[PDB]
Amino acid sequence: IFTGSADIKHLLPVETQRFQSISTEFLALMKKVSKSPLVMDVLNIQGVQRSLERLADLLGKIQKALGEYLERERSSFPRFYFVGDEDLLEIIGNSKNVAKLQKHFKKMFAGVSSIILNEDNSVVLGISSREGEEVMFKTPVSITEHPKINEWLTLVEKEMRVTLAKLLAESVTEVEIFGKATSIDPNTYITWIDKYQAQLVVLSAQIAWSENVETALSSMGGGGDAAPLHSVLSNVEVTLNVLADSVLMEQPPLRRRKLEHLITELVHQRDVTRSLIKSKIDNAKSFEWLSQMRFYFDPKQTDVLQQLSIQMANAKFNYGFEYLGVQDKLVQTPLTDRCYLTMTQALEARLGGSPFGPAGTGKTESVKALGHQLGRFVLVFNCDETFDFQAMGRIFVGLCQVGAWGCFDEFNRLEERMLSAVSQQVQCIQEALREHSNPNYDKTSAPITCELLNKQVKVSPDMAIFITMNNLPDNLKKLFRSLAMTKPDRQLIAQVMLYSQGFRTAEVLANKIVPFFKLCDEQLSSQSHYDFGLRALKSVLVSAGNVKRERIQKIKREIAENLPEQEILIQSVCETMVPKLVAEDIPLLFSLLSDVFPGVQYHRGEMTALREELKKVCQEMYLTYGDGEEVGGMWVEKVLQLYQITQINHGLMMVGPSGSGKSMAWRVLLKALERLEGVEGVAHIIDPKAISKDHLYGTLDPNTREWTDGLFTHVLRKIIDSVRGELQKRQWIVFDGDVDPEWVENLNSVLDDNKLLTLPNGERLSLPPNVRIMFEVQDLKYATLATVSRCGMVWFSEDVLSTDMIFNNFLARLRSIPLDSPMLQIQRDAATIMQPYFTSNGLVTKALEHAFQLEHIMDLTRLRCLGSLFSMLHQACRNVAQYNANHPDFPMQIEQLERYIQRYLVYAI
Amino acid sequence: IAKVQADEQFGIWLDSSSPEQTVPYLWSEETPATPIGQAIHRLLLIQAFRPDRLLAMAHMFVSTNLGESFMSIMEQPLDLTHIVGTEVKPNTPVLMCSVPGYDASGHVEDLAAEQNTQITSIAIGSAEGFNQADKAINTAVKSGRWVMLKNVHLAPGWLMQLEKKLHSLQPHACFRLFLTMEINPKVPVNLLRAGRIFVFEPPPGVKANMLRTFSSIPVSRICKSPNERARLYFLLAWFHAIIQERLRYAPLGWSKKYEFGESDLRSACDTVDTWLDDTAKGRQNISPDKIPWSALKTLMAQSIYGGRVDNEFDQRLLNTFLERLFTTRSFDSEFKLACKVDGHKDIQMPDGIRREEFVQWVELLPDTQTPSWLGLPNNAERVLLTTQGVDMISKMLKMQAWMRTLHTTASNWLHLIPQTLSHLKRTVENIKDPLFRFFEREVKMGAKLLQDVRQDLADVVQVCEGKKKQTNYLRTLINELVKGILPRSWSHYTVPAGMTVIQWVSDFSERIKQLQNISLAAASGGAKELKNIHVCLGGLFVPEAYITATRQYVAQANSWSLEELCLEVNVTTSQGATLDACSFGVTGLKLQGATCNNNKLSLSNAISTALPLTQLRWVKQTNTEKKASVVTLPVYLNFTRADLIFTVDFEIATKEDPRSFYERGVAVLCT
Ligand SMILES: Nc1ncnc2c1ncn2[C@@H]1O[C@H](COP(=O)(O)OP(=O)(O)OP(=O)(O)O)[C@@H](O)[C@H]1O
Ligand SMILES: Nc1ncnc2c1ncn2[C@@H]1O[C@H](COP(=O)(O)OP(=O)(O)O)[C@@H](O)[C@H]1O
């Protein structure tokens, strides 16, 4: 703690002095012990026990002092409760160098992942999100004027909120001009979209629509006479047309995300105004309008948190103005509307939200979307054994202090005692929230507090606890309002997403693609790696949008609305699903595609550039290559699919029964990439089960606190350091062997978008863009869904590698590789003699097919018996060579050799 | 047979209100029997004829065997003052277990009030409550007073510690310890064994439920603000009572067992209060049409009473009830809370303005509450009584050398279960038929399960004579067989909860016979004959897959897309009526609560009106709005409405209305 940093001396000076004295005495004692390491000699030194106990109690007292300092640092800046004790020690110690601070900002704030400082790192100019979006403070804060970490971080947070408020005011000022007009100019609209953040743009659109609808309803007091609601709907349609025209062109990814968020929100507003408000509704106080989430902007208010008010039914909320960056916006389906209504009603009554339902219906996502709608920091606590008391208690304290939201992914996944303790803590917090709204004590004078960490903790009124289920504990039955989220509306989520992607026939495409995925989940066989859920559907939809845009770009460099959108959709579906399908399910998939998409066919990518280097590499490695229906067509298709998912993402996983062309596929792919792209390929084949987890990743010395890297970590560190220049070279870490939830725990943070290996010692390794982590496994039977979902996959069924391919490889190696020139001649003669028997319907194939029917003491595998047969034929050739050596005159003749090989083949079979 | 055929009052006896009172002398005995033997024979007859009166006949048998008024003491109120005075030692705690949603502290507090002995009532929710209760019990056992511990089911470990602590000698004899708690399995067994358990249940009835609701709500809340608040609260209480009494009829009336507890009632009351305050700023009475009816209906259909509703049909039923009750017509003198009640009688809305009149009207409700009050058919009570009698029989069986009987049962099962059906499938030609692939999967699954079951039964048989060794899997299987629970390794398809092994093997034999017929039809002509098969959805392991295969086949013929096909259902009289290019015959469908004539539904008192032959037609969707004279009836798999296969659109007769179909739980069943 006290020597890895330099700023620790200023924060805790007197404790630093006491520790220096303790360390001096300890070093003197250690030097005395070193001169006589004998146990009896050490024990016989004058007063070892007395000085040792003095050091022990002094170290204890300074440890409680440091803990108290950490607690006061947490109390001064409440967001410090989210980071750990070691993380806080690093933060306070490394306050001078902000580089070590930026690795924590994604844990305290919501969207903030870094801070933009000055040239000398003196003033915090602004904040930056994870996606690169930057918010510049209107009045930048200075670290030199407020050197203490907590005070300048609090100034940063307050200035963030103020800057968001001012930007919202300006964006609303612009969007009121945009809204009260027709035939919006695309240029000015796009400039406005680029000017403001995605959160701000969406919020401004919502505010403008809400005020417009409120004004229209107020002017319609008499009735339907002189109805401007039609004008509001026409304005929304015009804006949607402008956005749909804009998304069809080439846009930056950030502006693309802003455009699709705007399209989603404008589609929701169009649906609301077209039907839910135009059904003979003329009063602003009617519940048909009060039920909808209305936004009211009052820029005249001085306080930033009081400027914007979000109201749904009788519940009124103040926007928290927390920076969120660019978050994924859910399509507001009627189920999402019901979720918002129920959760807001629960929050108004100071209860909790328990949206129970089957996994994958968006309960946690809906809770997060509602929290982001009100601008509140939302924390999700996964209960899939990545759970702990020591973090959760202080996280609850932080939620109470700062006023953020806390959602549990699946509370029933918690173990019984852990579940009971967390239920007790949640009950305490929720009882505090309930007393916060006492009818007799509505004017809260004394602060409402709860008993967390055996101490009083102030509870912010804006916080909330959401417990997603799949029943609730008896403690929380009377405190949480349940909500059944069982069947998500996929035929609308797909439609809105396809419309945002630029598709002009989104409704038909959704009505075709949702039942098709239902059929795939039903008609196709049951496999562990199959995923036809809502996330897979959304991924396929974004891939289809990317494919359509790529086709538009290709056609332009050679309006353009005549594309076969169904063909693009099925091409995306195939490119995403076929690689992970067993050979039995491919005809079923194509039959389902024909059933749902009639007469629309899928043509693969030719890839003739790489499909010639593949042929050359296969020729020079004695393999068999063929295109499509020819022999080896399925294998080269699997190789090309492996190349496709290699391009798409890192963290591959080639699965298939033992005996398929798995290792050869990626070896040939690596060699073909090396010969084609000119980039040398190096592959590190690692068996994870051969060595222990400590040897695989490294171990931290219990006493010395010295870290020695493991095999995988050593490989990654070597690839990163670039002492030899392994960059500009394709590095492939192939994890040949079996996969279990034990050794892949540290790899989960690498396989996902983090690409980040966190070591126990603290050192963090970043995955370079030229490294792919391949999993060459066999069954995928003991792998958690977390690892499978994070990895692109190609399935190598046994039908991929036919027996004729094995025979051709064996004969080619016999004719080329010497079993050590006369030996080569003997091998070629033997191969010529035995070639007729190694045919499609020859003696060997029929004998093998029959032999599968017999009973064997061990499970008969095709390659085991084939390899034994090849070895014994090699020994037959060796015997022929030995006989020729024994008879220098009159060697083996062609008739005698023919008879000997013909009989030896039967003997070996 | 001859006895029932010759008798002519037997028919009118079958339809009597209480057949158990006058059971005809039907058994043939050479010598006169004792009254107990007569009771046994009449009980057997009641089990055969009109099993719903089995509970009443069991009561009569208990009266004839153990003496009349044996159960009369139970009907009297629990005078537990004598039980806390004597028959309970101070060492033994008095456990007051209540059904979830009920409170037992009232009785004990009242007996303390009349016995002028104070109780240190303590809630065990908080952690400080542990120390408070410890101090209270110490002081009360030193002095000799009484102590209470409310909601102790929340602290199981602390309950075990309390049980350990109480085991020591307790110096005072006037000490009594009461543990008010909820009936939960988390309570320790030792505490239950060491104390006197008292089970408290809420009395059944709409009147009792509404009285409890009105007593719970303070008078100040109801008598406040516009006078319409009292009527709104009365409507809310009636709605809560209706939806809570419909829960007792779990399959028919609410599908599942939702909570619908006091929390939902309090939330609804808060919503009513807030919205009536918002709409009515002043204390003056507001017009009934100015009540925010839409707000109340939406918030009590989507947030309160609706959050825990998952399937769409219970939500539809809840919306029907809310739109019927919460409307501006409720404030008129002609409003009818429930119609058709007891045939012609109606529950007229009371004409009151204050809480007192509504409470008096509640107290004047007649005791003769039929299920027609709730909107359910009156036969729901009969069905519930039959189910309760079946449960009683099951309990008596559960509370009742095995090698011989297991051997004979397994041999009889082997004779019953068909031997073996072979996979006659996987033809390269005509694989394009979705029906062929679906029946391939069904035949493969059925054959695999049949082989597994037959091998396991043969193993059990061989071990019955001890001709072979016994393994762990076999031990578990034979234990579940002797105990009567179906093996978990045998359940590869959807099975109704609590299905006996005999019923399971009979159903499996029927399914295997159907699959054999399917295989024979496929072998005889090919996949063309697969189309013209009157398959029964109940026999099929996954009927939804059959519906999907039907849709795919009808699309592939004529080359349509699956999105454009909608299901049209036509019920034909002939069990073998000719099918067109799109109709697939489906047999075994049973309609509950209604009868279909010429594809037109009509409400009926009789349940389970079997459908002769159901023709499932997939026609191209014409994109039209369905008329107001059709109903979307669910098609569940079995009598336990837990799995939804698909929905059917039937046209109703012009006399009835769809709301009555919705609230009577009319649905189609595969089995
Ligand atoms: N065109 C070909 N592509 C790949 N392998 C081929 C080809 N022709 C013949 N073979 C032979 O097929 C075998 C392929 O084995 P491979 O190393 O790909 O299997 P694997 O899945 O990694 O093995 P396992 O999982 O069983 O340990 C080799 O014996 C190889 O010689
Ligand atoms: N209304 C919706 N709009 C858009 N996407 C949704 C919606 N509901 C769910 N999803 C998607 O479903 C996926 C999984 O939902 P998730 O919240 O993980 O389910 P669960 O609540 O069971 O964990 C998410 O990636 C989310 O994008």
From Swiss-Prot, chain A:
ATP binds at residues 357-364, 656-663. Residues 612-863 are annotated as: AAA 2. Residues 319-543 are annotated as: AAA 1. It comes from the Eukaryota. It is found in: Cytoplasm, Cytoskeleton. Signal peptide: none annotated. Dynein heavy chains probably consist of an N-terminal stem (which binds cargo and interacts with other dynein components), and the head or motor domain. The motor contains six tandemly-linked AAA domains in the head, which form a ring. A stalk-like structure (formed by two of the coiled coil domains) protrudes between AAA 4 and AAA 5 and terminates in a microtubule-binding site. A seventh domain may also contribute to this ring; it is not clear whether the N-terminus or the C-terminus forms this extra domain. Homodimer. The cytoplasmic dynein 1 complex consists of two catalytic heavy chains (HCs) and a number of non-catalytic subunits presented by intermediate chains (ICs), light intermediate chains (LICs) and light chains (LCs); the composition seems to vary in respect to the IC, LIC and LC composition. The heavy chain homodimer serves as a scaffold for the probable homodimeric assembly of the respective non-catalytic subunits. The ICs and LICs bind directly to the HC dimer and dynein LCs assemble on the IC dimer. Interacts with DYNC1LI1; DYNC1LI1 and DYNC1LI2 bind mutually exclusive to DYNC1H1. Cytoplasmic dynein 1 acts as a motor for the intracellular retrograde motility of vesicles and organelles along microtubules. Dynein has ATPase activity; the force-producing power stroke is thought to occur on release of ADP. Plays a role in mitotic spindle assembly and metaphase plate congression. Belongs to the dynein heavy chain family. It is linked to Charcot-Marie-Tooth disease, axonal, type 2O: An axonal form of Charcot-Marie-Tooth disease, a disorder of the peripheral nervous system, characterized by progressive weakness and atrophy, initially of the peroneal muscles and later of the distal muscles of the arms. Charcot-Marie-Tooth disease is classified in two main groups on the basis of electrophysiologic properties and histopathology: primary peripheral demyelinating neuropathies (designated CMT1 when they are dominantly inherited) and primary peripheral axonal neuropathies (CMT2). Cortical dysplasia, complex, with other brain malformations 13: An autosomal dominant disorder characterized by global developmental delay with impaired intellectual development. Some patients show signs of peripheral neuropathy, such as abnormal gait and hyporeflexia. CDCBM13 is associated with variable neuronal migration defects resulting in cortical malformations. This is Cytoplasmic dynein 1 heavy chain 1. The chain holds residues 1550 to 2498 of 4646 of the full protein.
From Swiss-Prot, chain B:
The modification Phosphoserine is found at S215. It is found in: Cytoplasm, Cytoskeleton. The modification N6-acetyllysine is found at K336. Residues 58-274 are annotated as: AAA 6. It comes from the Eukaryota. Cytoplasmic dynein 1 acts as a motor for the intracellular retrograde motility of vesicles and organelles along microtubules. Dynein has ATPase activity; the force-producing power stroke is thought to occur on release of ADP. Plays a role in mitotic spindle assembly and metaphase plate congression. Dynein heavy chains probably consist of an N-terminal stem (which binds cargo and interacts with other dynein components), and the head or motor domain. The motor contains six tandemly-linked AAA domains in the head, which form a ring. A stalk-like structure (formed by two of the coiled coil domains) protrudes between AAA 4 and AAA 5 and terminates in a microtubule-binding site. A seventh domain may also contribute to this ring; it is not clear whether the N-terminus or the C-terminus forms this extra domain. Homodimer. The cytoplasmic dynein 1 complex consists of two catalytic heavy chains (HCs) and a number of non-catalytic subunits presented by intermediate chains (ICs), light intermediate chains (LICs) and light chains (LCs); the composition seems to vary in respect to the IC, LIC and LC composition. The heavy chain homodimer serves as a scaffold for the probable homodimeric assembly of the respective non-catalytic subunits. The ICs and LICs bind directly to the HC dimer and dynein LCs assemble on the IC dimer. Interacts with DYNC1LI1; DYNC1LI1 and DYNC1LI2 bind mutually exclusive to DYNC1H1. It is linked to Charcot-Marie-Tooth disease, axonal, type 2O: An axonal form of Charcot-Marie-Tooth disease, a disorder of the peripheral nervous system, characterized by progressive weakness and atrophy, initially of the peroneal muscles and later of the distal muscles of the arms. Charcot-Marie-Tooth disease is classified in two main groups on the basis of electrophysiologic properties and histopathology: primary peripheral demyelinating neuropathies (designated CMT1 when they are dominantly inherited) and primary peripheral axonal neuropathies (CMT2). Belongs to the dynein heavy chain family. This is Cytoplasmic dynein 1 heavy chain 1. The gene is DYNC1H1. The chain holds residues 3948 to 4645 of 4646 of the full protein.
